[PDB]
Amino acid sequence: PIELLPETPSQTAGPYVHIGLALEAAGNPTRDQEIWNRLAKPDAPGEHILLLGQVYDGNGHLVRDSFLEVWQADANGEYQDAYNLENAFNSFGRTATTFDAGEWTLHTVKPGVVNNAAGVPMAPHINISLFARGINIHLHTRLYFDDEAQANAKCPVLNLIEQPQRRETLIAKRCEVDGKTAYRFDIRIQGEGETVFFDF
Amino acid sequence: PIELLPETPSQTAGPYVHIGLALEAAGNPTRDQEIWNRLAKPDAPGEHILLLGQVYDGNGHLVRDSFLEVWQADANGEYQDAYNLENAFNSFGRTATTFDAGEWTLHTVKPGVVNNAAGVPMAPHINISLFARGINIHLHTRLYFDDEAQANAKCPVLNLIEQPQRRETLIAKRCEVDGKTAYRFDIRIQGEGETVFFDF
Amino acid sequence: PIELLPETPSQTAGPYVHIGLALEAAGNPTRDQEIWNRLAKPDAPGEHILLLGQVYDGNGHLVRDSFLEVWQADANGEYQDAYNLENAFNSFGRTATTFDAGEWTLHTVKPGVVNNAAGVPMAPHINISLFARGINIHLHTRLYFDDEAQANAKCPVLNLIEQPQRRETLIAKRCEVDGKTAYRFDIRIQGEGETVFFDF
Amino acid sequence: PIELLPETPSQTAGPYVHIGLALEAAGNPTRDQEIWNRLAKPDAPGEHILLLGQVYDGNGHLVRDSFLEVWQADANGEYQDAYNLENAFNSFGRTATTFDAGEWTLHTVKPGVVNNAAGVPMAPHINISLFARGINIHLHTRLYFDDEAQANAKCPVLNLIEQPQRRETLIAKRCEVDGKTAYRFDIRIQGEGETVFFDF
Amino acid sequence: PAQDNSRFVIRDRNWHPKALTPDYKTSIARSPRQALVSIPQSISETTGPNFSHLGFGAHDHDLLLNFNNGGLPIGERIIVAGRVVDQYGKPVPNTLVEMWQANAGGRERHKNDRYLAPLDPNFGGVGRCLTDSDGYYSFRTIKPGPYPWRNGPNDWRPAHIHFGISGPSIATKLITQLYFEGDPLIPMCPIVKSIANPEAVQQLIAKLDMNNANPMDCLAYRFDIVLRGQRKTHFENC
Amino acid sequence: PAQDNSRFVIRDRNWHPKALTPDYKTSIARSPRQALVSIPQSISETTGPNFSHLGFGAHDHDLLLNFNNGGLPIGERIIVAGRVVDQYGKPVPNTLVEMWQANAGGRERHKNDRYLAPLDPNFGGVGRCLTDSDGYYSFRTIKPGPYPWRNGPNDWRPAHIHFGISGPSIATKLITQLYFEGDPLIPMCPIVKSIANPEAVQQLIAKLDMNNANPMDCLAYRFDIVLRGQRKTHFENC
Amino acid sequence: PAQDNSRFVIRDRNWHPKALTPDYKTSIARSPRQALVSIPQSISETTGPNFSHLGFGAHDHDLLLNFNNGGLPIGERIIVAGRVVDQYGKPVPNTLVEMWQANAGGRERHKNDRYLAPLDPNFGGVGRCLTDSDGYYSFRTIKPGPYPWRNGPNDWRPAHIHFGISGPSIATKLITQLYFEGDPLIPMCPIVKSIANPEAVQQLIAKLDMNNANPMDCLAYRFDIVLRGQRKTHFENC
Ligand SMILES: [Fe+3]
Ligand SMILES: [Fe+3]
Ligand SMILES: [Fe+3]
Ligand SMILES: [Fe+3]
């Protein structure tokens, strides 16, 4: 058959990924420009929301060195690819859980609807890539919203998961932290309640 | 040592097993003679009983594409091998669980006692072979009855299972389906309460 | 793919084939029973005919050491396979051209119609196998009759030859030798007028 | 020495060439634009001429499944390469002989003179490429005209053919088809009067 | 009735595919975590049904004609024949051989297959046949086409025909899959890779058989099946 | 107009099949007995048509849709793509690639094919395409099936697609046949055996290309074509 | 905004390390037990960030100068350079390369690092760079040292540099480790042995590059990274 050049294989981000990728969360000095957890400036268009979660290993214990990267459409369903700290909204962001902060946080806006390649609308989501020591190749997952029950029911992506109980692990539960709208989204790498992880 | 020709290797029966082995179940037209789930005709001697069960995977989910073949002695303890749709009793039969029907059923008569090779009597049992998508080589198991507790406690097969709690996974529970005597035999492929499976 | 045992390869019958296969035509003493050129005794059923021909090489010169074997149905279209010199008709016969006799002869009956494997009638024919020095593997051909123009037109065998001019090389021309019906059939191994040869 | 990548090898065009290259001829529906046998439109400059011929195999039989492509200069001696169905003249065209039509025809204008690489003028000619079942790699030939005897006698191509009698096989005979000026160009693939074929 | 007079050679569980073969994804939740418990052979495991008296329809083994709604199926016409023997080389007569497959484009005739290759109105996809006195069986059908499935993101099952063989007892019964000689999808399919030894894979590859082909009509493949060997008991219980 | 400014590398007549290859029977009466006469290249041999302005219909390269009478063709859905380059590795842009083939059962849509595999009412068997600026072409179609023919008594053409390529001149034009990786009929076909060197045979075998496949939809094969190299003239006539 | 015009070649999950590699102890509790769910590529997976307007500091690629508290780091001065191409061999321009590493004695500048080799007061350990039009990136740094870790009782990581590369989409993002040619610790590390195929291990190894070294100054290593092949969509939704 036809063989192309092989992709460079993956390796674990290791324990101190933060020193290279989350300068602040590592407690080291930062540079002038850093890629971080604040996707939307306060005046950007859309419903502003706070996102939070913990990450668990297979024995129920908290993963405190994980690193996460997010990609989402803005409030009109458009991916903003030109990353610039001046922009009111970037579609890309990074966050982390640390020894001090067992919980990660992201400040963005609720994404709008995008279509899959056959033109069917997908429910609003957030693409998440998870890296950490012990994870040899990163885990891709998607964060959906409990208050978008109707569109979640028809998402052609959520529908590819055979078992109805497993689609619930991708649904983030609405709450309020200081009069501000927040969704909680915990990730269980392994075991009871294992979050669904994708391949593409 | 002496090496004979190797056995052809087993491959999974696949999601569409119903098309070649359970025609009606695949919802396709049947031929004149089909091997199905009515081992006993209304006038066959012995005690008429309805069997049913559900098949679970290791996440606790129903297997709705499984296929089962059974082999049992008649009411007097004899294996009827010449299969014929006109016989009153055939010792063999097939059944299946489908999307429609999550449960399989089999209409037969409670088997009489047969001896092992060593002349020792076995408790009354039904030989079962389970096939499906995801199973690479079929699983063998035995269905025994909860109301035959004296013979079960002495069966030389049930006593080869070391732990007592594992013997119970093979003992079908007497109940009533439409007012008719029935034994429910649920199979758990993996996990908590995993059904004992044999090699012979 | 599947390979069977290979067939023993052919070799030429060589120059003196007659000593092993045409004792008389070699001028050697014969045995009590010989396979020869007289297929029909005078009282056998059917139109008795005399067959004759010469055989030519690629330079127009006569082949004088050829050996020939014939197989044909009797007058009702039936192959008589039980060879016996007592029978009034044998379907098998052998003849030859020699240094003395440049011409071969056969005494038989006009064969009747047989069907091909799809049940379509074939025109009356005679199957001929030709051997000689210089011929590495024998040549199969068929002798048809000029007076069976209608059935020759529909023979599914003669129709497989693409070119109308080449089917004429398989047609034997009626004549009379001593008040007896005879068909002449010359065979040109190579060149102008090359006789058609088959493979099956 | 230096070896470049090898050319893909040629394979015969096959008996059904008409299906991909001569749609009408295969008797199949045509697309909007087809490359066919009318190189000149009624108003193209030069002398309008009809070409026709038959193709023979080495037994003297017609080839009724041949396909021909032609390339010729226009009346002023220029090769028109931009092919377009609206042009008045296209220098390229295709035609074919079929079971129906044993003869091919081509409607064009008599080509003007072109020079070889050495600045020497060639006689007026049509470049022909012949394809069919049985031909493993296509045959190149040149059609010249019998009424251009002075230019033919000096053509530096026709003079590379050593024997004079072989030069004549390339010279199409002026005749009249429906009262219209025509040149008949029969091709003999093999045998007596075999047409000269070139390699370049 | 059936009587206990045979023993069958124990299965080599390292030759057959294992239960847990994670590249085949559905096997992860459908494989037992506890060990199989070994039990001696008795009359329950050494006898099995016999299908001599089952009423076969006349085109049961002929898939070019057994479904038929007004024509012939579109696809490579083939005969698939072979012999069923045991591990001693002894033929297995009067046994039941079942088979089912996709059509030429890879679509299977079942409600749940949503693959975009169309259904063929003259093709069903099912056959049965009883082996003969020498263990031969034979079916005629069209060659199936490969199809994609939801395993990895670009997985494609090589062309295959599912086979099921009863043999003389429940101990011998087997469901397997035939593949076709030369198919470049065979070494990349995770289901075929569930068989760890490359030599066991070769046993499922049917070979082109020009000798059994009907000229101007259909090719043929040969597929021989080998069931567990059978022996008489000897020195048992003394 | 076209101008004589290129030379093409002379054809290796021992790499291409010879004219007389007696196992291919029809070639016996259709092959010349006299030698080919060699002639220098001039403007007549080094120029050729250009097909940029030909009016292609929108589905000319898409055989799953270009014939269409109410559905889709039955058969293995495939993309056949590749690149056309010259012997120097230089791409050949805006060139004409034509192709035609049998259907899935091996029947070809022409009056004279009397083979018993049926016609597919949604399939035509023809495509054309112009290469792109980098020399790529691509067609979508179903995989053809093999068919028997009247050569030897049990000869069968391996699955194939006929291709025709114009290139920049009549000197480069070529008609050939694509075969599919792994087909066990390839080494027994007398037409393929007309090519004497085994290395030239490999050049006609399209390879399975999982990288270009559309997941859950169609496989792909890659088939690269190499035309005669082209060079500028140098030191000619002084 | 970003448009859905590409498709990426599916990843080979037998080439990359599996999730469960028990000798690397931390992978046991941090590897999913359910099969990954395959999904088609949509605009969510085929686009990603472009970091062209990120404001880079002038020494962000130069580890000998970007931390700096009085002088130079102690250790072997080296240039690590290479190119980023996709599996079709096409440069990936303007992409983000980030890297981080230990100091010359294997100590990392992080609070939880308690290995007893001292910190280097002039070394921070972090760089970023954007590949150029041709896919080239370069860093200047000191070769790191190996260090021990609590895995097995005497496990030591070979000297290595971590890499994170963005590529054109989130489908191509990859984090890996670079290793140095000849380090005898490479075949003994359980993290490197998470890669089952030895030819995949080889791709992680930077080769000494004396052509790029600066004489009398620093050595150079070359490490080329290959991201998933990218192609235009063809024949989708018909
Ligand atoms: Fe590290
Ligand atoms: Fe299947
Ligand atoms: Fe001799
Ligand atoms: Fe063909």
Swiss-Prot record, chains A, B, C, D:
Belongs to the intradiol ring-cleavage dioxygenase family. The gene is pcaG. The enzyme is an oligomer of 12 copies of the alpha and beta chains. Binds Fe(3+) ion per subunit. This is Protocatechuate 3,4-dioxygenase alpha chain. Plays an essential role in the utilization of numerous aromatic and hydroaromatic compounds via the beta-ketoadipate pathway. Keywords: Aromatic hydrocarbons catabolism, Dioxygenase, Iron, Oxidoreductase. Its EC number is 1.13.11.3. Coiled coil: none annotated. It catalyses: 3,4-dihydroxybenzoate + O2 = 3-carboxy-cis,cis-muconate + 2 H(+). Disulfide bonds: none annotated. It comes from Pseudomonas putida (Arthrobacter siderocapsulatus). GO terms for biological process: beta-ketoadipate pathway. Pathway: Aromatic compound metabolism; beta-ketoadipate pathway; 3-carboxy-cis,cis-muconate from 3,4-dihydroxybenzoate: step 1/1.
Curated annotation (Swiss-Prot), chains E, F, G:
The lineage of its organism: Bacteria, Pseudomonadati, Pseudomonadota, Gammaproteobacteria, Pseudomonadales. CDD domains: 3_4-PCD_beta. The keyword Phosphoprotein does not apply. Binds Fe(3+) ion per subunit. This is Protocatechuate 3,4-dioxygenase beta chain. Its cofactor is Fe(3+). Plays an essential role in the utilization of numerous aromatic and hydroaromatic compounds via the beta-ketoadipate pathway. Its EC number is 1.13.11.3. It comes from the Bacteria. Pathway: Aromatic compound metabolism; beta-ketoadipate pathway; 3-carboxy-cis,cis-muconate from 3,4-dihydroxybenzoate: step 1/1. SUPFAM superfamilies: Aromatic compound dioxygenase (SSF49482). InterPro entries: Intradiol_dOase_C, Intradiol_dOase_core, Intradiol_RC_Dioxygenase, PCDO_beta_N, Protocat_dOase_b.
